[PDB]
Amino acid sequence: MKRTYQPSKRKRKKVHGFRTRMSTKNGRRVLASRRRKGRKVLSA
Amino acid sequence: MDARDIIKRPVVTEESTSILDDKKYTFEVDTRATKTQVKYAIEEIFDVKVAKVNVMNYKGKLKRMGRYAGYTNKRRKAIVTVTADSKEIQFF
Amino acid sequence: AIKKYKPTTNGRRHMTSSDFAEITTSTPEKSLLRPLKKKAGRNNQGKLTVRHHGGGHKRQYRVIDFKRNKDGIPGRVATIEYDPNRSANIALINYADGEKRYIIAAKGLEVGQTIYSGAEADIKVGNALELKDIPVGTVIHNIEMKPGKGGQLVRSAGTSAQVLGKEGKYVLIRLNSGEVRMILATCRATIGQVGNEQHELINIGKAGRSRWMGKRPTVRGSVMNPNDHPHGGGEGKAPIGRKSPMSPWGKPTLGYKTRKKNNNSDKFIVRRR
RNA sequence: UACCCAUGUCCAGGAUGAAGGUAAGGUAAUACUUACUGGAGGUCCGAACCCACGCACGUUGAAAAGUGCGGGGAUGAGGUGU
RNA sequence: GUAUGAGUAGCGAAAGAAGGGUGAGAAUCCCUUCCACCGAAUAUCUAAGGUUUCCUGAGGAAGGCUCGUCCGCUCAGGGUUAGUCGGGACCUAAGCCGAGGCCGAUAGGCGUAGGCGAUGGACAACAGGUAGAGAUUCCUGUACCAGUGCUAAUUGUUUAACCGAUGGGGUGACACAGAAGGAUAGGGAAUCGCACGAAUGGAAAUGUGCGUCCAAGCAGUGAGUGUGAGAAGUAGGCAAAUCCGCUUCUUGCGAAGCAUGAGCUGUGAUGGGGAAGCGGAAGUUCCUGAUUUCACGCUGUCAAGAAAAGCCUCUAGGAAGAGUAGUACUGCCCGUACCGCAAACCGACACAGGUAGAUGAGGAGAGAAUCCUAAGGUGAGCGAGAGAACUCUCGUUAAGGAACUCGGCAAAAUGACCCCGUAACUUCGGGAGAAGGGGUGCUCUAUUAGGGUGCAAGCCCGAGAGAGCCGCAGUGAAUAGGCCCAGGCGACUGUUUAGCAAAAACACAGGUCUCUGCAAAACCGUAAGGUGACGUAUAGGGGCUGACGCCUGCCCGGU
Ligand SMILES: [Mg+2]
Ligand SMILES: [Mg+2]
Ligand SMILES: [Mg+2]
Ligand SMILES: [Mg+2]
Ligand SMILES: [Mg+2]
Ligand SMILES: [Mg+2]
Ligand SMILES: [Mg+2]
Ligand SMILES: [Mg+2]
Ligand SMILES: [Mg+2]
Ligand SMILES: [Mg+2]
Ligand SMILES: [Mg+2]
Ligand SMILES: [Mg+2]
Ligand SMILES: [Mg+2]
Ligand SMILES: [Mg+2]
Ligand SMILES: [Mg+2]
Ligand SMILES: [Mg+2]
Ligand SMILES: [Mg+2]
Ligand SMILES: [Mg+2]
Ligand SMILES: [Mg+2]
Ligand SMILES: [Mg+2]
Ligand SMILES: [Mg+2]
Ligand SMILES: [Mg+2]
Ligand SMILES: [Mg+2]
Ligand SMILES: [Mg+2]
Ligand SMILES: [Mg+2]
Ligand SMILES: [Mg+2]
Ligand SMILES: [Mg+2]
Ligand SMILES: [Mg+2]
Ligand SMILES: [Mg+2]
Ligand SMILES: [Mg+2]
Ligand SMILES: [Mg+2]
Ligand SMILES: [Mg+2]
Ligand SMILES: [Mg+2]
Ligand SMILES: [Mg+2]
Ligand SMILES: [Mg+2]
Ligand SMILES: [Mg+2]
Ligand SMILES: [Mg+2]
Ligand SMILES: [Mg+2]
Ligand SMILES: [Mg+2]
Ligand SMILES: [Mg+2]
Ligand SMILES: [Mg+2]
Ligand SMILES: [Mg+2]
Ligand SMILES: [Mg+2]
Ligand SMILES: [Mg+2]
Ligand SMILES: [Mg+2]
Ligand SMILES: [Mg+2]
Ligand SMILES: [Mg+2]
Ligand SMILES: [Mg+2]
Ligand SMILES: [Mg+2]
Ligand SMILES: [Mg+2]
Ligand SMILES: [Mg+2]
Ligand SMILES: [Mg+2]
Ligand SMILES: [Mg+2]
Ligand SMILES: [Mg+2]
Ligand SMILES: [Mg+2]
Ligand SMILES: [Mg+2]
Ligand SMILES: [Mg+2]
Ligand SMILES: [Mg+2]
Ligand SMILES: [Mg+2]
Ligand SMILES: [Mg+2]
Ligand SMILES: [Mg+2]
Ligand SMILES: [Mg+2]
Ligand SMILES: [Mg+2]
Ligand SMILES: [Mg+2]
Ligand SMILES: [Mg+2]
């Protein structure tokens, strides 16, 4: 039938975007730990 | 920017040169230049009278050269048409 | 009266409804309307705190005058019309100033009457006075508890109270539930009974007519699981295998009194219901 | 996916004929009877749409739940987009 | 890393054939003819999503379930043009953030002013052309919206032209169902124009084929739909108001006047498009007719059907400049390529699955059903040849007709329109399409009896009867209820274990018990803050029973 992933440009940025991570204390911890690994892309 | 900073270089192709006789000139402009700045930049450099400007944005093409993937520069292309009672620009 | 439907369909077999013979107009006053949005029993935090709510016809709020502060200015009953937000009907009043306000329609109120409020008002159905100057034995409604707040105690359709006596600073009132209560003598009240007394006799008749009013289905606790309700579990049908029937949160539900035992307002209640 | 909120949108055709109204009759006046009108309903038959009752086949599948022939609802406690 | 199974299973719904061409090499690439498939789609647009997959020139290592000279693959160059389209510089809903502020071991939670936020509101452009790739964007023609400067006249200067709110008021502004109309799109016949005029018995005309037009804007008109007029006075609209609201008098009515209003006519048109043989003739009359528009307009019902901006108006205020006409100039940012029921989106795949919306023709037909076709699009990325067992999907069967089997499971049978006729029981509505029967084709009466349309010409709709004619068979194909008797359960419509159980289970309208006097009880949270409820005992929460009919007995020692 229909599958679990239904793409949407707006829905992706509003949940996983950079400004969403920067608005919470625990979202800034995700960016801090992703910078520690030196990951190419932070957030979505 | 300056007049020489807004405008970078002309575009010389089959489509670009097929409209030179129509008094339409194709340029590559700065990515952050508005349609009005391009109008006054042309009149400062070539001293022609400008009638219209049409702009469009181009993305970068994904290119490969062996195990390496990247993109070319994104472009901003402007087409300038001049009034009939004005001089011409010699791409030559 | 009460309209009755022929048994044309199984869902129309037992329905009864009002005929709205007392409703004068079908358009509300545009300047006294406010939007309402359904909460569906959802909390400040988006949680479902009250069950069996949500999903009916959409409505709009009518600004209704409960304080009735406009003293000395006559007001004519212009229309009697329908309010979806309450059981009783409402009436539009054109005051002599040119300004319009909504009140609850009392029993025996019809278009063309004149309604007063204040100390000099007469004891007629629809007028509003302070309790200090209303004769003993009259039937009133829209009683308020704090002076200047607005009508609060008797407000449903067909309900009414009665004045029993005076105790100086206070006035005895027998509320609609049969409770005798002391009310401050400076508070206000409106004369008469609320006028839609046929509202009790409506037979809904359909499962889906309850859904138009915003009432989602209710599930008995005996057909749940042991982790859902104290009554859940058991092979086959099971009785209430406990000392007393209990609410979904513990706290026995049959006969158990839940009024606070050290409540301040307990000295103003002469006798309980 | 479950429930809810705000704002949009979809449901080919056909059938039946509730309340009410009008005319003739009928009465002291009403009940009531007959014709025409009217267009109600979690009404009926049935496509799109939603669903999943039977069987067969697939079962290192076309498919980590499907297809084929029949089947239920189809103006509502309806389906569906953002 | 490499074997065995093994050159074995598979190669993913479907109709292809031949003749030319290219090439080292052709079932598979290109062209031509014939044939076949879809056609309320397998056709045309357009959102989301994907990001160059679009075009041209080269290429055949790998990918393509075979082949390849080919490709959505590789390489190199190109391609997306907006004052008017969609979004921002305009507005707000749900929701989110939130100066001060209220709570809280920290972290933080909540929340006022204020602000973001479309899936909605407001808002000025149409018709053609474009042979590699863009078109309300480029070009041609004709427009509109806002603003600016300049020329010529007009007017006014503080008893003050004119402007006018970030404030008041009106509008914007709204549900569902039903019916009857006006118009138009679409469709169909004659007329007219052009071409042919014929292969095999016949036809030079009651012959055949194709076509039988056109915007926005501007001027006029217009089916209709709403439709009380004037005067006087102001306890109200945070101040004021000549505006709104309220009161009182004169005057009354399918008659006008005011708002809207689909459409029609002239101009736009000395323009554009147009079948044939590069130029281009003709464009009339009638019938039918919407699921589109007038228009939530009218009627009815109860479950009682967003906000703000915008527009108009009123003053508060600002005021020496202001309108008018003509001309010329000015108008920003983002998207625009291509696929888009699909080989380019979500499913690991070039995957028999899923994917919102607008249009969606003809014959027969009530119909978007069914069969065959139009415009348009396709022949499905392995083949040919033999016609064994066995498996799957179909078609017929002599005599019998459930004897099969756990069980008539599966299959077979009924099926459309018109007429006759129809039981027990009943909550009087039903049961009921009960059951059971009869008639359907073609020709002549006959451009019917009669209707719709029109001034007439004419054009559509078509029941009864008679006479006949032909088959085994006349809704001659596809599509279209099998029925009856009796009992258990559940009153009914509805819901349920995505992926083993659709039910006698849940729900339901109704009944009863019990709590709750409002800072209500109950519930979430440490609290603040909330739902309950912008409600008030005819209201709200909890337990049990489950339409309707007749009823619901005894025990208070134990808990
Ligand atoms: Mg979310
Ligand atoms: Mg990421
Ligand atoms: Mg652009
Ligand atoms: Mg409840
Ligand atoms: Mg229940
Ligand atoms: Mg259970
Ligand atoms: Mg327990
Ligand atoms: Mg138990
Ligand atoms: Mg048991
Ligand atoms: Mg409880
Ligand atoms: Mg209904
Ligand atoms: Mg139904
Ligand atoms: Mg769907
Ligand atoms: Mg289900
Ligand atoms: Mg079906
Ligand atoms: Mg099926
Ligand atoms: Mg059925
Ligand atoms: Mg073997
Ligand atoms: Mg073998
Ligand atoms: Mg294949
Ligand atoms: Mg996109
Ligand atoms: Mg290509
Ligand atoms: Mg290959
Ligand atoms: Mg070669
Ligand atoms: Mg090639
Ligand atoms: Mg390529
Ligand atoms: Mg233009
Ligand atoms: Mg816009
Ligand atoms: Mg703060
Ligand atoms: Mg907050
Ligand atoms: Mg706000
Ligand atoms: Mg915004
Ligand atoms: Mg929008
Ligand atoms: Mg516009
Ligand atoms: Mg194209
Ligand atoms: Mg409104
Ligand atoms: Mg026509
Ligand atoms: Mg005033
Ligand atoms: Mg015109
Ligand atoms: Mg209405
Ligand atoms: Mg395009
Ligand atoms: Mg393939
Ligand atoms: Mg596919
Ligand atoms: Mg449609
Ligand atoms: Mg058709
Ligand atoms: Mg037809
Ligand atoms: Mg149709
Ligand atoms: Mg066919
Ligand atoms: Mg046989
Ligand atoms: Mg036989
Ligand atoms: Mg038998
Ligand atoms: Mg046997
Ligand atoms: Mg047997
Ligand atoms: Mg069977
Ligand atoms: Mg029967
Ligand atoms: Mg015979
Ligand atoms: Mg049942
Ligand atoms: Mg299951
Ligand atoms: Mg099942
Ligand atoms: Mg509290
Ligand atoms: Mg509250
Ligand atoms: Mg039970
Ligand atoms: Mg008992
Ligand atoms: Mg005891
Ligand atoms: Mg005792």
JSON list of N, CA and C (backbone and C1' of nucleotides) in Angstrom, two decimals, chain D residues 10-24:
[
{"chain": "D", "resi": 10, "resn": "C", "atom": "P", "xyz": [-15.64, 20.07, -5.15]},
{"chain": "D", "resi": 10, "resn": "C", "atom": "O5'", "xyz": [-15.61, 18.49, -4.95]},
{"chain": "D", "resi": 10, "resn": "C", "atom": "C5'", "xyz": [-14.79, 17.66, -5.76]},
{"chain": "D", "resi": 10, "resn": "C", "atom": "C4'", "xyz": [-15.05, 16.20, -5.47]},
{"chain": "D", "resi": 10, "resn": "C", "atom": "C3'", "xyz": [-16.50, 15.76, -5.56]},
{"chain": "D", "resi": 10, "resn": "C", "atom": "O3'", "xyz": [-16.87, 15.42, -6.88]},
{"chain": "D", "resi": 10, "resn": "C", "atom": "C1'", "xyz": [-15.54, 14.96, -3.54]},
{"chain": "D", "resi": 11, "resn": "C", "atom": "P", "xyz": [-18.38, 15.62, -7.40]},
{"chain": "D", "resi": 11, "resn": "C", "atom": "O5'", "xyz": [-19.16, 14.38, -6.78]},
{"chain": "D", "resi": 11, "resn": "C", "atom": "C5'", "xyz": [-18.82, 13.05, -7.15]},
{"chain": "D", "resi": 11, "resn": "C", "atom": "C4'", "xyz": [-19.47, 12.03, -6.25]},
{"chain": "D", "resi": 11, "resn": "C", "atom": "C3'", "xyz": [-20.97, 12.13, -6.09]},
{"chain": "D", "resi": 11, "resn": "C", "atom": "O3'", "xyz": [-21.67, 11.56, -7.18]},
{"chain": "D", "resi": 11, "resn": "C", "atom": "C1'", "xyz": [-19.94, 11.76, -3.98]},
{"chain": "D", "resi": 12, "resn": "A", "atom": "P", "xyz": [-22.91, 12.33, -7.85]},
{"chain": "D", "resi": 12, "resn": "A", "atom": "O5'", "xyz": [-22.97, 11.73, -9.33]},
{"chain": "D", "resi": 12, "resn": "A", "atom": "C5'", "xyz": [-21.96, 12.01, -10.28]},
{"chain": "D", "resi": 12, "resn": "A", "atom": "C4'", "xyz": [-22.29, 11.43, -11.63]},
{"chain": "D", "resi": 12, "resn": "A", "atom": "C3'", "xyz": [-23.76, 11.35, -11.98]},
{"chain": "D", "resi": 12, "resn": "A", "atom": "O3'", "xyz": [-24.26, 12.59, -12.47]},
{"chain": "D", "resi": 12, "resn": "A", "atom": "C1'", "xyz": [-22.70, 9.30, -12.52]},
{"chain": "D", "resi": 13, "resn": "G", "atom": "P", "xyz": [-25.83, 12.92, -12.38]},
{"chain": "D", "resi": 13, "resn": "G", "atom": "O5'", "xyz": [-26.49, 11.89, -13.39]},
{"chain": "D", "resi": 13, "resn": "G", "atom": "C5'", "xyz": [-27.85, 11.52, -13.25]},
{"chain": "D", "resi": 13, "resn": "G", "atom": "C4'", "xyz": [-28.08, 10.08, -13.63]},
{"chain": "D", "resi": 13, "resn": "G", "atom": "C3'", "xyz": [-29.38, 9.48, -13.13]},
{"chain": "D", "resi": 13, "resn": "G", "atom": "O3'", "xyz": [-30.50, 9.84, -13.92]},
{"chain": "D", "resi": 13, "resn": "G", "atom": "C1'", "xyz": [-27.63, 8.01, -12.62]},
{"chain": "D", "resi": 14, "resn": "G", "atom": "P", "xyz": [-31.72, 10.64, -13.25]},
{"chain": "D", "resi": 14, "resn": "G", "atom": "O5'", "xyz": [-32.66, 9.49, -12.69]},
{"chain": "D", "resi": 14, "resn": "G", "atom": "C5'", "xyz": [-33.14, 8.47, -13.56]},
{"chain": "D", "resi": 14, "resn": "G", "atom": "C4'", "xyz": [-33.34, 7.16, -12.85]},
{"chain": "D", "resi": 14, "resn": "G", "atom": "C3'", "xyz": [-34.42, 7.11, -11.79]},
{"chain": "D", "resi": 14, "resn": "G", "atom": "O3'", "xyz": [-35.73, 7.06, -12.32]},
{"chain": "D", "resi": 14, "resn": "G", "atom": "C1'", "xyz": [-32.50, 6.01, -10.99]},
{"chain": "D", "resi": 15, "resn": "A", "atom": "P", "xyz": [-36.92, 7.85, -11.57]},
{"chain": "D", "resi": 15, "resn": "A", "atom": "O5'", "xyz": [-37.28, 6.90, -10.34]},
{"chain": "D", "resi": 15, "resn": "A", "atom": "C5'", "xyz": [-37.60, 5.53, -10.54]},
{"chain": "D", "resi": 15, "resn": "A", "atom": "C4'", "xyz": [-37.63, 4.77, -9.24]},
{"chain": "D", "resi": 15, "resn": "A", "atom": "C3'", "xyz": [-38.62, 5.25, -8.19]},
{"chain": "D", "resi": 15, "resn": "A", "atom": "O3'", "xyz": [-39.94, 4.82, -8.44]},
{"chain": "D", "resi": 15, "resn": "A", "atom": "C1'", "xyz": [-36.53, 4.77, -7.18]},
{"chain": "D", "resi": 16, "resn": "U", "atom": "P", "xyz": [-41.19, 5.75, -8.04]},
{"chain": "D", "resi": 16, "resn": "U", "atom": "O5'", "xyz": [-41.28, 5.61, -6.46]},
{"chain": "D", "resi": 16, "resn": "U", "atom": "C5'", "xyz": [-41.48, 4.34, -5.84]},
{"chain": "D", "resi": 16, "resn": "U", "atom": "C4'", "xyz": [-41.19, 4.39, -4.36]},
{"chain": "D", "resi": 16, "resn": "U", "atom": "C3'", "xyz": [-42.06, 5.35, -3.55]},
{"chain": "D", "resi": 16, "resn": "U", "atom": "O3'", "xyz": [-43.28, 4.75, -3.17]},
{"chain": "D", "resi": 16, "resn": "U", "atom": "C1'", "xyz": [-39.76, 5.58, -2.94]},
{"chain": "D", "resi": 17, "resn": "G", "atom": "P", "xyz": [-44.68, 5.52, -3.34]},
{"chain": "D", "resi": 17, "resn": "G", "atom": "O5'", "xyz": [-44.63, 6.65, -2.23]},
{"chain": "D", "resi": 17, "resn": "G", "atom": "C5'", "xyz": [-44.31, 6.33, -0.88]},
{"chain": "D", "resi": 17, "resn": "G", "atom": "C4'", "xyz": [-43.72, 7.51, -0.15]},
{"chain": "D", "resi": 17, "resn": "G", "atom": "C3'", "xyz": [-44.67, 8.70, 0.00]},
{"chain": "D", "resi": 17, "resn": "G", "atom": "O3'", "xyz": [-44.49, 9.32, 1.28]},
{"chain": "D", "resi": 17, "resn": "G", "atom": "C1'", "xyz": [-42.72, 9.37, -1.16]},
{"chain": "D", "resi": 18, "resn": "A", "atom": "P", "xyz": [-45.72, 10.10, 1.95]},
{"chain": "D", "resi": 18, "resn": "A", "atom": "O5'", "xyz": [-45.16, 10.58, 3.36]},
{"chain": "D", "resi": 18, "resn": "A", "atom": "C5'", "xyz": [-45.14, 9.71, 4.49]},
{"chain": "D", "resi": 18, "resn": "A", "atom": "C4'", "xyz": [-44.55, 10.41, 5.69]},
{"chain": "D", "resi": 18, "resn": "A", "atom": "C3'", "xyz": [-45.18, 11.75, 6.04]},
{"chain": "D", "resi": 18, "resn": "A", "atom": "O3'", "xyz": [-46.34, 11.62, 6.84]},
{"chain": "D", "resi": 18, "resn": "A", "atom": "C1'", "xyz": [-42.84, 12.01, 5.90]},
{"chain": "D", "resi": 19, "resn": "A", "atom": "P", "xyz": [-47.56, 12.66, 6.67]},
{"chain": "D", "resi": 19, "resn": "A", "atom": "O5'", "xyz": [-47.00, 14.02, 7.30]},
{"chain": "D", "resi": 19, "resn": "A", "atom": "C5'", "xyz": [-46.69, 14.11, 8.68]},
{"chain": "D", "resi": 19, "resn": "A", "atom": "C4'", "xyz": [-45.89, 15.35, 8.99]},
{"chain": "D", "resi": 19, "resn": "A", "atom": "C3'", "xyz": [-46.57, 16.68, 8.69]},
{"chain": "D", "resi": 19, "resn": "A", "atom": "O3'", "xyz": [-47.48, 17.08, 9.71]},
{"chain": "D", "resi": 19, "resn": "A", "atom": "C1'", "xyz": [-44.36, 16.72, 7.85]},
{"chain": "D", "resi": 20, "resn": "G", "atom": "P", "xyz": [-48.93, 17.64, 9.33]},
{"chain": "D", "resi": 20, "resn": "G", "atom": "O5'", "xyz": [-48.64, 18.90, 8.39]},
{"chain": "D", "resi": 20, "resn": "G", "atom": "C5'", "xyz": [-48.15, 20.11, 8.93]},
{"chain": "D", "resi": 20, "resn": "G", "atom": "C4'", "xyz": [-47.61, 21.03, 7.86]},
{"chain": "D", "resi": 20, "resn": "G", "atom": "C3'", "xyz": [-48.63, 21.64, 6.91]},
{"chain": "D", "resi": 20, "resn": "G", "atom": "O3'", "xyz": [-49.30, 22.76, 7.46]},
{"chain": "D", "resi": 20, "resn": "G", "atom": "C1'", "xyz": [-46.79, 20.81, 5.67]},
{"chain": "D", "resi": 21, "resn": "G", "atom": "P", "xyz": [-50.85, 23.04, 7.12]},
{"chain": "D", "resi": 21, "resn": "G", "atom": "O5'", "xyz": [-50.85, 23.46, 5.58]},
{"chain": "D", "resi": 21, "resn": "G", "atom": "C5'", "xyz": [-50.25, 24.67, 5.15]},
{"chain": "D", "resi": 21, "resn": "G", "atom": "C4'", "xyz": [-50.28, 24.80, 3.65]},
{"chain": "D", "resi": 21, "resn": "G", "atom": "C3'", "xyz": [-51.66, 24.80, 3.01]},
{"chain": "D", "resi": 21, "resn": "G", "atom": "O3'", "xyz": [-52.27, 26.07, 3.04]},
{"chain": "D", "resi": 21, "resn": "G", "atom": "C1'", "xyz": [-50.20, 23.34, 1.82]},
{"chain": "D", "resi": 22, "resn": "U", "atom": "P", "xyz": [-53.87, 26.21, 3.13]},
{"chain": "D", "resi": 22, "resn": "U", "atom": "O5'", "xyz": [-54.38, 25.82, 1.67]},
{"chain": "D", "resi": 22, "resn": "U", "atom": "C5'", "xyz": [-54.12, 26.67, 0.56]},
{"chain": "D", "resi": 22, "resn": "U", "atom": "C4'", "xyz": [-54.52, 26.01, -0.74]},
{"chain": "D", "resi": 22, "resn": "U", "atom": "C3'", "xyz": [-55.97, 25.58, -0.86]},
{"chain": "D", "resi": 22, "resn": "U", "atom": "O3'", "xyz": [-56.84, 26.65, -1.21]},
{"chain": "D", "resi": 22, "resn": "U", "atom": "C1'", "xyz": [-54.55, 23.84, -1.62]},
{"chain": "D", "resi": 23, "resn": "A", "atom": "P", "xyz": [-58.38, 26.62, -0.75]},
{"chain": "D", "resi": 23, "resn": "A", "atom": "O5'", "xyz": [-59.04, 25.51, -1.68]},
{"chain": "D", "resi": 23, "resn": "A", "atom": "C5'", "xyz": [-59.35, 25.78, -3.05]},
{"chain": "D", "resi": 23, "resn": "A", "atom": "C4'", "xyz": [-59.89, 24.56, -3.75]},
{"chain": "D", "resi": 23, "resn": "A", "atom": "C3'", "xyz": [-61.14, 23.93, -3.13]},
{"chain": "D", "resi": 23, "resn": "A", "atom": "O3'", "xyz": [-62.33, 24.58, -3.53]},
{"chain": "D", "resi": 23, "resn": "A", "atom": "C1'", "xyz": [-59.55, 22.24, -3.60]},
{"chain": "D", "resi": 24, "resn": "A", "atom": "P", "xyz": [-63.65, 24.49, -2.62]},
{"chain": "D", "resi": 24, "resn": "A", "atom": "O5'", "xyz": [-64.18, 23.01, -2.86]},
{"chain": "D", "resi": 24, "resn": "A", "atom": "C5'", "xyz": [-64.74, 22.61, -4.10]},
{"chain": "D", "resi": 24, "resn": "A", "atom": "C4'", "xyz": [-65.07, 21.14, -4.12]},
{"chain": "D", "resi": 24, "resn": "A", "atom": "C3'", "xyz": [-65.96, 20.63, -3.00]},
{"chain": "D", "resi": 24, "resn": "A", "atom": "O3'", "xyz": [-67.34, 20.88, -3.22]},
{"chain": "D", "resi": 24, "resn": "A", "atom": "C1'", "xyz": [-64.10, 19.21, -3.20]}
]
